[PDB]
Input
Amino acid sequence: DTCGSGYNVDQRRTNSGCKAGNGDRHFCGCDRTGVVECKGGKWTEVQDCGSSSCKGTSNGGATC
Output
C-alpha cells in the first residue's frame, strides 16, 4: 500500500502488501526511517535509516 494522504510518491507502508512486479525497487517507509523492498509479498525494511532521512522517487531508488 502507499502511505495515504499527506505522504509522497516515493513512500510505501512497511509490512503492507506489494505486487510482485515491484521487483527489487526500493521505496521509503511512511516515517522515512527505513528503506523498504517488496519481499514475500510485503514491503520489508531492508535498511534502518534510524532517523527520518529516507528519500527516493516514484520509480524506486530510495536511500537513507
